[PDB]
A paper describes a structure:
A second V-region that repeatedly confers potent (IC50 < 0.1 μg/mL) neutralization is IGVH1-58 (mAbs: 55, 165, 253, and 318). Three antibodies (55, 165, and 253) harbor a disulfide bond in their CDR3s, compete strongly with each other for binding, and map to the neck epitope but do not compete with mAb 318. Unexpectedly, we found a 10-fold increase in neutralization titers when the heavy chain of mAb 253 (IGVH1-58, IGVK3-20) was combined with the light chain of either mAb 55 or 165, which have the same V-gene pairing (IGVH1-58, IGVK3-20) but a different J gene, having IGKJ1 in contrast of IGKJ2 in mAb 253. Remarkably the sole difference in contact residues is a Trp for Tyr substitution in mAbs 55 and 165. The most common configuration observed for the spike construct we have used is 1 RBD-up and 2-down. In our structures, we see Fabs 40, 150, 158, and the chimeras 253H55L and [name] binding to the spike in this one-up configuration. However, mutations that eliminate glycosylation had a deleterious effect on neutralization for these two and for the [name] chimera.
S from both [name]-[name]-2 and [name]-[name]-1 uses angiotensin-converting enzyme 2 (ACE2) as the cell surface receptor (Hoffmann et al., 2020, Li, 2015), ACE2 is expressed in a number of tissues, including epithelial cells of the upper and lower respiratory tracts. S consists of two subunits, S1 that mediates receptor binding and S2 responsible for viral and host cell membrane fusion (Walls et al., 2020; Wrapp et al., 2020). The S1 fragment, at the membrane distal tip of S, includes an N-terminal domain (NTD) and receptor binding domain (RBD). Although both regions are immunogenic, the RBD contains the interacting surface for ACE2 binding (Lan et al., 2020).
Residue numbers in the entry:
A (entry chain B): 348 to 545
B (entry chain H): 1 to 138, 144 to 224
C (entry chain L): 1 to 214
D (entry chain A): 447 to 496
The structure:
C-alpha cells in the first residue's frame, strides 16, 4: 500500500520465528526500538500490529521514533515510546516502472501533524494562503498527495523500498502471541534441571 | 536576506541553447513557486511561464511552449530555465520571480525578483571598440567621443576619469547592420575652457578587456 | 488568453501632482490575483500593489489601488521624483499570467528648444574608410524631435541611426544623437554636411552644417 | 551532539558484579563468523551517547 494509506494487519495467536528474518541480508534495514533485535523470540505479547507501505530510500531514515519530515509528519508518525521493530527492503525490481510509477502516493501538504499511528487519506485541496480554495487547485491551493514516480534507473535513495513496522501491543488480557520457544534433548538417569511445557 | 540571484550575461550563437539559473534565499524554497518573464530591449514584459517548486508542475505561455523548459532543484534551492534553438529574437533580459514563504504559508504575489540575465544571440564575435573624437566646432560648446564597432554590450564611458559628470549625456547604444554596436557620449562645456582644460573620455569594454582613454582636441 | 492593457502610454506629470493609471483586462479576473509592479531603466521589476488593494512591503502609502473585474486603477496621491519610471499590471489568476505594455511616467516641463551641434567624422575614422557625422540635440522637451540629414542639399534616408537618452534627473530634458554613416568614397564625393532639427521649441527647423575640410 | 561518552551495546553474556569489559571485538549477532570484519550481523559492541 501507499505510505499515506498504510495497511494494518492484526496478528493474534500465531507462533513466529524472527530469527530467519533477522538473519536475512535481503532486508536492507532491520532496526528495533524498545526491544533488542537479537532477543526477540522470547518476548510474548497479546497482539501484534503490522503496518506496511512503500517509500523511497531517502525516506527510510524517517521511519523511526522521534523523526520529522514529509513522511513522519504527514504520512506515518511513530510514537516516541514505540516498542517494536522496523524492517525495510529494496523493492526496485517490483515497484519501479520505466517513466515513473503512479500507484504509490504520499501526502505532501497538511495543516497539522499526524498523531502516532494515524492514517490520513483525505484528498482535500491544501489552502496555503488566506484565500479559501473551493475545490479547485491553483495558487496557494495544491493537491495534498503526490506520486513517487519510481523508476528502475532512479538513484538508490529514490528507488522504491517496502517497509513493514511490527508493533507488539500488550493489554489487560491474556498474552496470545508467543515465540518459537525451542527445546533441547533430554537425558535420563542423571540429575538434571528440567523445563517442561509450563 | 530574502534574495533571488540570476546568472550572468550570456552570448550564444543562433541555434544553440542557454540555461539561466535562479537561486533563492531567505525563504523556504520547497513550498513556493518560480515564474520566468522576458523583456526585450525597450519592450514590455513578456510572461514565459511558472513552476510549482514542491510538485514540479509547469505552465508555459503559448509563445514559449516550444523552446522553454522550466526546472528546479530543491537541494540547491535553485530553479533553471532552458531555452533551446536560440535566435536573434531571443536577445532580451530574463527575470525570475517568487513569493517568499515560511515552512507552511506563502506570500500572495511575486515580491522577490532577480537582477535579470541578458541573453544576446547573434553570429558576431567579441571585439573591442574604436573611440573617435567628436571635436567641438571653432557661449557653450559640445564635444564628445564615438564608441564605434564593438561587441557585445555594454560599454561604460566616463569623463575625466569620473571627475566630469555635469552636462554629460551617454546615449544608449544602437545595433548596426554589421552586428556591432555604436554609442555616442557628449558633454557641454563653456567656450572659454576649450584651450585650458584637457578633456579625455574613458571607454571601458569588459567583454573585450578594452580600456581606451581618448583626448578630444579642438581642431 | 487574458489580455492586459495599460493607460496612458506616456504620463507627463509634474512632481507633486496626483497620478492615475488604468489597467483593463479582456475578461473578468479575480481582484485577489492582480498586481502592480514598478520598473526603472536598467533595474528589475519591483512589486508595488497586490490583491488589487493591498500595499506591498516597503512601498510608500501614497501608492493606492482600486478596481474590480475588468477595470483597475493605480493612484499616486503626490508624485515624487523617485516615482518616475515604468508601471506594469499583471493578472496571476488564470494562466497564462499576462503582463501589460507599461506606462512611462515622465516629469512634465516647459517647452525647451534643443541646442544643436554637428560633428564631422574624425580623420582617424576616415583612415579606416568610413565616415560618421554626428548631430547632437542637447537638453530639450518634450522628447519628440526630428532630425534630417542633408548632404550637398540632398536629403538622406536609410543611412542614419538615432539614439535618445532617458529624461534627465536634474533638468527633466532629453538628448538625441543621430549618426550618418557613409563610405570614404561617398564622403569625399560631397562637401557640405548638415543636420536639420525640427522640434516643438523651435519656431522653425534649425540647420547646423559644416564644409568638408574647412 | 556529544559522542565522546560510549556504552557497550552487545555482549555474549551479562557482566558479573563489578566486572569491566573494554574489549572492542566485533559482536557476531548472526551465524556468520565476522573474523574481525564489520557488516551484516557483525556490529561494533560500543555505541556513542547522543
Ligand atoms: C507562516 O506565515 C503565515 C502567514 O504569513 C504571511 O505571509 C508571509 C509571506 C509574510 O508576508 C507574513 O507577514 C504574512 O503574515 C502564518 O499564518 C498566519 O498565522 C497567524 C498566527 O498568529 C494567524 O493569525 C494568521 O491568520 C495566519 N495567516 C495565514 C494566511 O495563514 C503562519 O503561522 C506562519 N508559519 C510559521 C511556521 O511561521
Amino acid at each position: 500500500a501507499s505510505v499515506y494509506a498504510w495497511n494494518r494487519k492484526r496478528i493474534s495467536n500465531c507462533v513466529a520465528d524472527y530469527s530467519v528474518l533477522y538473519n536475512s541480508a535481503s532486508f536492507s534495514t532491520f532496526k528495533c526500538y524498545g526491544v533488542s533485535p537479537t532477543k526477540l523470540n522470547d518476548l510474548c505479547f497479546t497482539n501484534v500490529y503490522a503496518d506496511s507501505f512503500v517509500i523511497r530510500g531517502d525516506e527510510v531514515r524517517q521511519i523511526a521514533p522521534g523523526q520529522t519530515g514529509k513522511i513522519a509528519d504527514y504520512n506515518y508518525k511513530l510514537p516516541d515510546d514505540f516498542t517494536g521493530c522496523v524492517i525495510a527492503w529494496n523493492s526496485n525490481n517490483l515497484d519501479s516502472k520505466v517513466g515513473g510509477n503512479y500507484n504509490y502516493l504520499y501526502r505532501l501538504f497538511r495543516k497539522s501533524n499526524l498523531k502516532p499511528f494515524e492514517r490520513d487519506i483525505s484528498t482535500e485541496i491544501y489552502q496555503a494562503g488566506s484565500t479559501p480554495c473551493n475545490g479547485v487547485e491553483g495558487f496557494n491551493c495544491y493537491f495534498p498527495l503526490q506520486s513517487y514516480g519510481f523508476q528502475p534507473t532512479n538513484g538508490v535513495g529514490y528507488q522504491p523500498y517496502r517497509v513493514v513496522v511490527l508493533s507488539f501491543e500488550l493489554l489487560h488480557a491474556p498474552a496470545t502471541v508467543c515465540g518459537p520457544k525451542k527445546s533441547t534433548n533430554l537425558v535420563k538417569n542423571k540429575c538434571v534441571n528440567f523445563n517442561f511445557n509450563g | 536576506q530574502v534574495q533571488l540571484v540570476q546568472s550572468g550575461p550570456e552570448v550564444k550563437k543562433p541555434g544553440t541553447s542557454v540555461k539561466v539559473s535562479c537561486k533563492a534565499s531567505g525563504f523556504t524554497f520547497t513550498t513556493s513557486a518560480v515564474q520566468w518573464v522576458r523583456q526585450a530591449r525597450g519592450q514590455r514584459l513578456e510572461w514565459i511561464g511558472w513552476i510549482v517548486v514542491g510538485s514540479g508542475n509547469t505552465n508555459y505561455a503559448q509563445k514559449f511552449q516550444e523552446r522553454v523548459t522550466i526546472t528546479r532543484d530543491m537541494s540547491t534551492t535553485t530553479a533553471y530555465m532552458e531555452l533551446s534553438s536560440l535566435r536573434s529574437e531571443d536577445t532580451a533580459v530574463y527575470f525570475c520571480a517568487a513569493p517568499h514563504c515560511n515552512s507552511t504559508s506563502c506570500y500572495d504575489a511575486f515580491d522577490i525578483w532577480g537582477q535579470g540575465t541578458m541573453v544576446t544571440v547573434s553570429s558576431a564575435s567579441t571585439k573591442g571598440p574604436s573611440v573617435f573624437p567628436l571635436a567641438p566646432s571653432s557661449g557653450t560648446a559640445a564635444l564628445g567621443c564615438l564608441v564605434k564597432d564593438y561587441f557585445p554590450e555594454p560599454v561604460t564611458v566616463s569623463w575625466n576619469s569620473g571627475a566630469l559628470t555635469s552636462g554629460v549625456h551617454t546615449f544608449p547604444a544602437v545595433l548596426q547592420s554589421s552586428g556591432l554596436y555604436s554609442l555616442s557620449s557628449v558633454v557641454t562645456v563653456p567656450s572659454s575652457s576649450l584651450g585650458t582644460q584637457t578633456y579625455i573620455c574613458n571607454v571601458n569594454h569588459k567583454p573585450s578587456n578594452t580600456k581606451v582613454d581618448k583626448k578630444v582636441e579642438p581642431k | 488568453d487574458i489580455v492586459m492593457t495599460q493607460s496612458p502610454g506616456t504620463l507627463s506629470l509634474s512632481p507633486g501632482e496626483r497620478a492615475t493609471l488604468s489597467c483593463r483586462a479582456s475578461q473578468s479576473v479575480r481582484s485577489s490575483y492582480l498586481a502592480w509592479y514598478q520598473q526603472k531603466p536598467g533595474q528589475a521589476p519591483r512589486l508595488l500593489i497586490y490583491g488589487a488593494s493591498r500595499r506591498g512591503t516597503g512601498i510608500p502609502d501614497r501608492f493606492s489601488g482600486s478596481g474590480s473585474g475588468t477595470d483597475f486603477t493605480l493612484t499616486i496621491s503626490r508624485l515624487e521624483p523617485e516615482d518616475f519610471a515604468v508601471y506594469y499590471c499583471q493578472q496571476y489568476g488564470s494562466s497564462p499570467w499576462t503582463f501589460g505594455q507599461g506606462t512611462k511616467v515622465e516629469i512634465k516641463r516647459t517647452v525647451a528648444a534643443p541646442s544643436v551641434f554637428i560633428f564631422p567624422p574624425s580623420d582617424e575614422q576616415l583612415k579606416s574608410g568610413t565616415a560618421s557625422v554626428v548631430c547632437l540635440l542637447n537638453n530639450f522637451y518634450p522628447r519628440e524631435a526630428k532630425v534630417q540629414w542633408k548632404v550637398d542639399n540632398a536629403l538622406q534616408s536609410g543611412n542614419s541611426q538615432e539614439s535618445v537618452t532617458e529624461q534627465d534627473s536634474k533638468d527633466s530634458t532629453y538628448s538625441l544623437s543621430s549618426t550618418l554613416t557613409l563610405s570614404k568614397a561617398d564622403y569625399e564625393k560631397h562637401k557640405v554636411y548638415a543636420c536639420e532639427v525640427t522640434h516643438q521649441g523651435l519656431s522653425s527647423p534649425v540647420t547646423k552644417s559644416f564644409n568638408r575640410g574647412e
